[PDB]
Coordinates of C-alpha atoms and ligand atoms in Angstrom, one line a residue:
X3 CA 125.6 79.4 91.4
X4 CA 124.9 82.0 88.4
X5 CA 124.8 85.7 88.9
X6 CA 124.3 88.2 87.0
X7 CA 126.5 91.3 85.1
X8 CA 128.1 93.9 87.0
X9 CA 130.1 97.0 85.9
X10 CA 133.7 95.2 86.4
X11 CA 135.3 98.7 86.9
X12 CA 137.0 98.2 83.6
X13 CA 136.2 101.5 81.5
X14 CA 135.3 100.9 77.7
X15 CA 133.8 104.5 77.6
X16 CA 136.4 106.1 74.6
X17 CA 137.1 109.4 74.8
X18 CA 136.2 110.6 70.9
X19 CA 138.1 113.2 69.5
X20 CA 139.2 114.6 66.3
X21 CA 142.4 112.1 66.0
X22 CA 140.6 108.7 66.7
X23 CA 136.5 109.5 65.9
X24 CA 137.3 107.8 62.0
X25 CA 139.1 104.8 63.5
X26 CA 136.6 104.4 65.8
X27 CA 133.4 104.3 63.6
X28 CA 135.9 101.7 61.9
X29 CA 136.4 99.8 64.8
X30 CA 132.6 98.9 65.6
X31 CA 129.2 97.6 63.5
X32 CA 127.2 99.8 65.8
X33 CA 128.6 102.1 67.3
X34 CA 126.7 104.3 70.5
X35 CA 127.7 108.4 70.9
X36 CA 127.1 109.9 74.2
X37 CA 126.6 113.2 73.7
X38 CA 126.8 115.5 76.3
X39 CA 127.5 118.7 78.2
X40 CA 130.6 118.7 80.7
X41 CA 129.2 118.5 84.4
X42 CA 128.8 121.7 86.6
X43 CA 132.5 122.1 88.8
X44 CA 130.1 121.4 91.8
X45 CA 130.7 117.6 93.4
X46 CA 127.1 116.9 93.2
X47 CA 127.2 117.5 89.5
X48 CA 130.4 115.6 89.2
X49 CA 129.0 112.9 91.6
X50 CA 125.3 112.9 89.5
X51 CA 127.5 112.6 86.3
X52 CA 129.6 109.8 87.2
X53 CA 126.8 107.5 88.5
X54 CA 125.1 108.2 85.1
X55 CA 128.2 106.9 83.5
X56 CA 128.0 103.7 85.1
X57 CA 124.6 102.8 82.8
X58 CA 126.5 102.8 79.4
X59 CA 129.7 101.1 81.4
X60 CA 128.0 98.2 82.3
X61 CA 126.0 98.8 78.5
X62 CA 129.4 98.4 76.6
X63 CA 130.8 95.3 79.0
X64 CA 127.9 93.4 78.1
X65 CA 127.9 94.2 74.9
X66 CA 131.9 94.2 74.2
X67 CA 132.2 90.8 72.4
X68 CA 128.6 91.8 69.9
X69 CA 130.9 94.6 67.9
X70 CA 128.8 97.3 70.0
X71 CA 131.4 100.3 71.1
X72 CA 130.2 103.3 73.2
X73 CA 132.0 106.4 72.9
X74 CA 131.8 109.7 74.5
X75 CA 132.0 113.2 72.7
X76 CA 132.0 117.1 75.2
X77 CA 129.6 119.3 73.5
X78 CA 133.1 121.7 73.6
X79 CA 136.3 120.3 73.7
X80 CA 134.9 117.9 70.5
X81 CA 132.5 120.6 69.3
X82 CA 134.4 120.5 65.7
X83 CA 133.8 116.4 65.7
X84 CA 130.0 116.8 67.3
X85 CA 129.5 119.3 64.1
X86 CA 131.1 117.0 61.6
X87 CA 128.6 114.0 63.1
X88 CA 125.5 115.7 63.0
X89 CA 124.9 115.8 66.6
X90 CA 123.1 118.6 67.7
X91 CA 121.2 117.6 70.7
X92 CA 123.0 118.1 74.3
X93 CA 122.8 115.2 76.2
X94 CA 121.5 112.7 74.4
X95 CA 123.0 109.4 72.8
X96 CA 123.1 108.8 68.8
X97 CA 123.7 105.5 67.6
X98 CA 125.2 104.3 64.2
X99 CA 125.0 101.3 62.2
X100 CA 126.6 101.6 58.7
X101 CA 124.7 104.0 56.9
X102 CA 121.8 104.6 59.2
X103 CA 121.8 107.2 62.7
X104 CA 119.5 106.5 65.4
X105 CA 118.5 109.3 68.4
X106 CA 118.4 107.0 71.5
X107 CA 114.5 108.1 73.0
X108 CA 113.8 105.6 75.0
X109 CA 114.5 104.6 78.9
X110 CA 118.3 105.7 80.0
X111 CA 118.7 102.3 82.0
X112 CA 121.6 99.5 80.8
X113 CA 119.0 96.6 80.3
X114 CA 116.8 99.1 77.8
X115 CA 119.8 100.4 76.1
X116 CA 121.3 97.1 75.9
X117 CA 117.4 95.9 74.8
X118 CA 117.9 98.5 72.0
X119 CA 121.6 97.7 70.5
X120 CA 120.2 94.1 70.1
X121 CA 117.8 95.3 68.2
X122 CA 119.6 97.7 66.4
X123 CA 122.2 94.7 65.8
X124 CA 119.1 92.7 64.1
X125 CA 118.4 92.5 60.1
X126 CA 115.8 94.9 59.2
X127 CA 113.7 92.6 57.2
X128 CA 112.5 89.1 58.5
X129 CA 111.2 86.7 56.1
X130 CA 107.8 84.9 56.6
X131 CA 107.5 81.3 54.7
X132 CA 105.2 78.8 55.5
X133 CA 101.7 78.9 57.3
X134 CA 102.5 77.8 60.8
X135 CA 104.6 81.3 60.7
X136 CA 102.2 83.6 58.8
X137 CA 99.9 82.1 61.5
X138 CA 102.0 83.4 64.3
X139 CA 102.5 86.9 62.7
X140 CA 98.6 87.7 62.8
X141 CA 98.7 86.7 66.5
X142 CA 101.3 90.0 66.9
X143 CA 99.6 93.2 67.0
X144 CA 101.3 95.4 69.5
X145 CA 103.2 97.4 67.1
X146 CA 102.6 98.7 63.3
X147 CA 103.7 95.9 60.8
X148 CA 104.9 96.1 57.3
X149 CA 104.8 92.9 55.2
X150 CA 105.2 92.6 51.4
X151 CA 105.2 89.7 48.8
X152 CA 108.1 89.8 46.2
X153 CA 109.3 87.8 43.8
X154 CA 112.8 87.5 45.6
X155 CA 116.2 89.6 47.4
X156 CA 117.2 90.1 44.2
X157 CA 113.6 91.9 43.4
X158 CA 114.4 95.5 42.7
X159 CA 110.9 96.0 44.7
X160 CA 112.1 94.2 47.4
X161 CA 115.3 96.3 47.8
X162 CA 113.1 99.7 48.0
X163 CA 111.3 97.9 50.8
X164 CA 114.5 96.6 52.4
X165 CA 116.2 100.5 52.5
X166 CA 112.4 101.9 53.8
X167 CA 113.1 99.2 56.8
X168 CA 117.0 100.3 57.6
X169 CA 115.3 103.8 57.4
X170 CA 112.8 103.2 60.5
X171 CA 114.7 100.7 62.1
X172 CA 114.5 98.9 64.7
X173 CA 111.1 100.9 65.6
X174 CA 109.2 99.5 62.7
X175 CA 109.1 96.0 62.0
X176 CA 109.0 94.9 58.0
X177 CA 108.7 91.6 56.4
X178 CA 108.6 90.0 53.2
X179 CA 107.5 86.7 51.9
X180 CA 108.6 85.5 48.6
X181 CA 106.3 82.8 49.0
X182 CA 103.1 82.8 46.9
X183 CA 100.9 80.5 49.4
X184 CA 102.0 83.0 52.3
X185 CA 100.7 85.8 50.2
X186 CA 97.6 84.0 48.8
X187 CA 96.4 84.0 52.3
X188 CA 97.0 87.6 53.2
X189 CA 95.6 88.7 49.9
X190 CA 98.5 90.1 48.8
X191 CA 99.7 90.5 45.1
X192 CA 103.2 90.4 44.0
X193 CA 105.1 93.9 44.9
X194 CA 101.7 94.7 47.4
X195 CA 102.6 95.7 50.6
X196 CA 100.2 95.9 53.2
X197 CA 100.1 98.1 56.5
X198 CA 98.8 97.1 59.7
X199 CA 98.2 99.6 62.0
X200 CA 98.8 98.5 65.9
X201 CA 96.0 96.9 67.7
X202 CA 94.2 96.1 64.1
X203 CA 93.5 92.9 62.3
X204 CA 92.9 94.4 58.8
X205 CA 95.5 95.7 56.8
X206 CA 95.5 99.2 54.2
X207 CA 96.9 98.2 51.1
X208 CA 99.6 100.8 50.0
X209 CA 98.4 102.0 47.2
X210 CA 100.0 102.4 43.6
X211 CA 102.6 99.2 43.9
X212 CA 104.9 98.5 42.6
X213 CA 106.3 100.7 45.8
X214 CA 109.4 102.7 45.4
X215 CA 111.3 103.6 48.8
X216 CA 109.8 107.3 48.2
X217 CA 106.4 105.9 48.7
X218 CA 106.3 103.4 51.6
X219 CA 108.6 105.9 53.4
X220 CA 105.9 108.6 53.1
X221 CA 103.0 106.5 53.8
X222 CA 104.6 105.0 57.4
X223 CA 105.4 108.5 58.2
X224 CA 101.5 109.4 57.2
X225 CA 100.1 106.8 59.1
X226 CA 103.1 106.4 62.1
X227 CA 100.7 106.8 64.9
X228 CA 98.3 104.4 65.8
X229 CA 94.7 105.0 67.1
X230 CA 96.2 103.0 70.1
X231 CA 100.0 102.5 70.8
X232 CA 102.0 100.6 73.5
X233 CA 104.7 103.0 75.2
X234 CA 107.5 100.7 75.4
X235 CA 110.8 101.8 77.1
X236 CA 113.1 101.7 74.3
X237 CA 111.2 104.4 72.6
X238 CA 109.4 105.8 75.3
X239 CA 110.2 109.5 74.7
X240 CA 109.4 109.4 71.2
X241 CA 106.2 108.1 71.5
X242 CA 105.2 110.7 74.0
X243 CA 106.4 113.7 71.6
X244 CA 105.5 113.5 68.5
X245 CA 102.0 115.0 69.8
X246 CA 100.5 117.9 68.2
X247 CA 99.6 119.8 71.4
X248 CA 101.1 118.4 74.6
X249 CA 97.6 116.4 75.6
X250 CA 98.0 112.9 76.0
X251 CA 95.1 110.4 76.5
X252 CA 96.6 107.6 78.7
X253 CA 95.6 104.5 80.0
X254 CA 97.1 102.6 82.8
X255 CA 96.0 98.7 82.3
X256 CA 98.6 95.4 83.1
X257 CA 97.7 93.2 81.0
X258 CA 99.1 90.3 82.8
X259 CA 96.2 91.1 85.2
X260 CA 92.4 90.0 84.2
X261 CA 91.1 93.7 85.5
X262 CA 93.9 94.9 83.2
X263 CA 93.7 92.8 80.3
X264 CA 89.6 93.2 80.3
X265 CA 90.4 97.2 79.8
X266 CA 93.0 96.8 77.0
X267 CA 90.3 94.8 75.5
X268 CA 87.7 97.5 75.5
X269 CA 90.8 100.1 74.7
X270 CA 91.2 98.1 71.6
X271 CA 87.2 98.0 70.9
X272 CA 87.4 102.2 70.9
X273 CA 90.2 102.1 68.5
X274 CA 88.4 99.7 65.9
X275 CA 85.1 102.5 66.7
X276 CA 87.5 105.0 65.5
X277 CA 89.0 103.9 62.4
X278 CA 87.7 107.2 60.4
X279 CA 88.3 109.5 63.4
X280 CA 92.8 110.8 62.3
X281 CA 92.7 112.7 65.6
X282 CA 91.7 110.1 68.0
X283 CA 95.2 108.8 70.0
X284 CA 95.2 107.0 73.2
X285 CA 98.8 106.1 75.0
X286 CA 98.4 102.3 76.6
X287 CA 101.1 102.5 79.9
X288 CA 101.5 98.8 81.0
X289 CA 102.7 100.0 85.0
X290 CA 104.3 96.1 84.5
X291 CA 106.7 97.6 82.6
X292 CA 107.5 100.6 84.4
X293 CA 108.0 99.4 88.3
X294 CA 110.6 102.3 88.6
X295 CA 108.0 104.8 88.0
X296 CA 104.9 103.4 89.3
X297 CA 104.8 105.3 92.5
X298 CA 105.5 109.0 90.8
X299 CA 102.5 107.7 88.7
X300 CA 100.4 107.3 91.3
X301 CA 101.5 110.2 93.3
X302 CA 101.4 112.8 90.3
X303 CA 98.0 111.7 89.2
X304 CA 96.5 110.7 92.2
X305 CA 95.1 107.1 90.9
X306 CA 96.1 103.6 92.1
X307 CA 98.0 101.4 89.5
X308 CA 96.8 98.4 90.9
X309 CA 93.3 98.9 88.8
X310 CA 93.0 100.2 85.4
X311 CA 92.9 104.0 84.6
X312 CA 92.4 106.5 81.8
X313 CA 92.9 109.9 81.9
X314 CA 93.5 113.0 79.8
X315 CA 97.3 115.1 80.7
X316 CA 97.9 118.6 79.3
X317 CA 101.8 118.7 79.6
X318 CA 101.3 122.9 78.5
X319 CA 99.1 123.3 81.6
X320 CA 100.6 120.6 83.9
X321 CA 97.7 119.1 85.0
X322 CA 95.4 116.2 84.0
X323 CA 91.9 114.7 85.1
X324 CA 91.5 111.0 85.6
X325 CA 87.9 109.0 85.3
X326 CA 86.2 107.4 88.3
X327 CA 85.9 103.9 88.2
X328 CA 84.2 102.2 91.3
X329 CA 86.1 99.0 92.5
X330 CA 82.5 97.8 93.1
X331 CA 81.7 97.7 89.7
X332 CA 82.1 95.9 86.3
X333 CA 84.5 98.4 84.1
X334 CA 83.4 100.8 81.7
X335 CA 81.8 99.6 78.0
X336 CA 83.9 101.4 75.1
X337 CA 81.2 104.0 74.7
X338 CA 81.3 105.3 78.0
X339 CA 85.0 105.8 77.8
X340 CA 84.2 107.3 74.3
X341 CA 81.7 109.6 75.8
X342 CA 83.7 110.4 78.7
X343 CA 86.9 111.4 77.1
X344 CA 84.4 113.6 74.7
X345 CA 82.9 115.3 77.6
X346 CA 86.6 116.5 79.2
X347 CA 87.7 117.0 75.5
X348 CA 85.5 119.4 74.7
X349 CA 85.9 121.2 78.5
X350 CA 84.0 120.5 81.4
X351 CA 84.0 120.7 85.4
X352 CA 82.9 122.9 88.3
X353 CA 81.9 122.5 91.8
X354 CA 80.4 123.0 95.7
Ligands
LIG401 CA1 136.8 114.2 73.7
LIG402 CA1 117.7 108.1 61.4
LIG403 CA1 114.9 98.6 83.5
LIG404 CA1 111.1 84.3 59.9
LIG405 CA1 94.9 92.6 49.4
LIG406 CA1 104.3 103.2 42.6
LIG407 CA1 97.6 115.4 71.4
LIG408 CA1 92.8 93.1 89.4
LIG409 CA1 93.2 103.9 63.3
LIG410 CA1 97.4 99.8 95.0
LIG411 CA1 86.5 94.2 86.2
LIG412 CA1 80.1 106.5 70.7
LIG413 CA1 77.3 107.8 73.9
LIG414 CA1 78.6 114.4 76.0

């Protein structure tokens, strides 16, 4: 009669300091740094703090046994080891993995961190052979793609495309083929590596291969955000910075719903209108993957998550505006939410 994991009470939290942080990073493939700022002396801070704890408690049990440690550092009694690390940022979680660090901005919840360390844990290249699995690969578009065709993993081509992966992993996904019926089919030349933005079907080549790490790394940072992008919990807050001005277009759609599904169709159909138009960036919230804060959603912005919804939010400001869609009626075409978001874009409203 099968459960499920529970913090066993059993702490696995270390307690870095200057004497063990070396044997530590030793100790562990990846290894998970909570930095943070001791609690206020009041017992609601103490209380708050100590409920937190339990997310990465339960986070280390389950992971215990995949060479995943979690360790704690105080912003002040570790200060010397927090400056020696590179961690700068109060409160927030780094994670290492041999030569690579990782800021933790997604979802503080065990089942998203513990998402994210398995993915972390994962190579950062997969290899596509054969055409059943190239066929499969076209059918994922949710996220940007990197896939190149080399000679081999001894390739010197392929290793600068290997250390570009470690260097956006596990938020990027790359793969290689070395085989030359795989890349026939995508068009690809030997050391070509294409780029498929999120939500698009047709690739941009990057341009003067062969590619040296200096050159895909600078391209994938040129081209990181995607017309339309998925916010997904494990990289939720990045996402949402990494915006020029603090407005957001978002749209609410689930796309396990037909309603839903229809508007993420029409999302994608602005996007593919849009493929000359840099500026253009639209934030696709599936409220299926957010239950937790589905009713602040609804409550902040005054829209109900059961149907589809776009809207612009000016985080400066701290307000937003929301379009009217009548329950009555067919959604909106992809121009009319191009030439809505234009008209609020460019400033509108006033009433009696
Ligand atoms: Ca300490
Ligand atoms: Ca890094
Ligand atoms: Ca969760
Ligand atoms: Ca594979
Ligand atoms: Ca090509
Ligand atoms: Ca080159
Ligand atoms: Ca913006
Ligand atoms: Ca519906
Ligand atoms: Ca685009
Ligand atoms: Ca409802
Ligand atoms: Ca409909
Ligand atoms: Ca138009
Ligand atoms: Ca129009
Ligand atoms: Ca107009």
């Amino acid at each position: 009669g099968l459960d499920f994991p529970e913090y066993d009470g059993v702490d696995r939290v270390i307690n870095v300091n200057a004497k063990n942080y070396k044997n530590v990073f030793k100790k562990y493939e990846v290894l998970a740094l909570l930095y943070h700022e001791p609690p206020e002396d009041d017992k609601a801070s103490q209380r708050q703090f100590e409920m937190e704890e339990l997310i990465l408690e339960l986070a280390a049990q389950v992971l215990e046994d995949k060479g995943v440690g979690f360790g704690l550092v105080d912003s002040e009694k570790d200060a010397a080891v927090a400056k020696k690390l590179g961690l700068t940022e109060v409160d927030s979680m780094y994670v290492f993995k041999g030569d690579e660090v990782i800021e933790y901005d997604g979802e503080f919840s065990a089942d998203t961190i513990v998402e994210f360390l398995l993915d972390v844990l994962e190579d950062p290249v997969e290899l596509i052979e054969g055409e059943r699995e190239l066929q499969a690969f076209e059918n994922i578009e949710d996220e940007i793609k990197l896939i190149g065709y080399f000679k081999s993993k001894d390739s010197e081509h392929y290793k600068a495309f290997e250390d570009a992966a470690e260097e956006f992993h596990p938020y990027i996904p790359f793969f290689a083929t070395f085989d030359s019926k795989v890349a026939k089919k995508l068009t690809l030349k030997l050391n070509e590596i294409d780029f498929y933005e999120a939500f698009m079907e047709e690739p941009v080549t990057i341009p003067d291969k062969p590619n040296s790490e200096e050159e895909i790394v600078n391209f994938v940072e040129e081209h990181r955000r995607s017309t339309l992008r998925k916010l997904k919990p494990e990289s939720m807050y990045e996402t949402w910075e990494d915006d020029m001005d603090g407005i957001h277009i978002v749209a609410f759609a689930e796309e396990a719903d037909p309603d839903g599904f229809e508007f993420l169709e029409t999302l994608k159909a602005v996007a593919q209108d849009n493929t000359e138009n840099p500026d253009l960036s639209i934030i696709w919230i599936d409220p299926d993957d957010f239950p937790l804060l589905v009713p602040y959603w609804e409550k902040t912005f005054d829209i109900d998550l059961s149907a589809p919804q776009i809207g612009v939010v000016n985080v400066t400001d701290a307000d937003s505006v929301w379009m009217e869609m009548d329950d009555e009626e067919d959604l909106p075409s992809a121009e009319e939410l191009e030439d809505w978001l234009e008209d609020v874009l460019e400033g509108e409203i006033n009433t009696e």
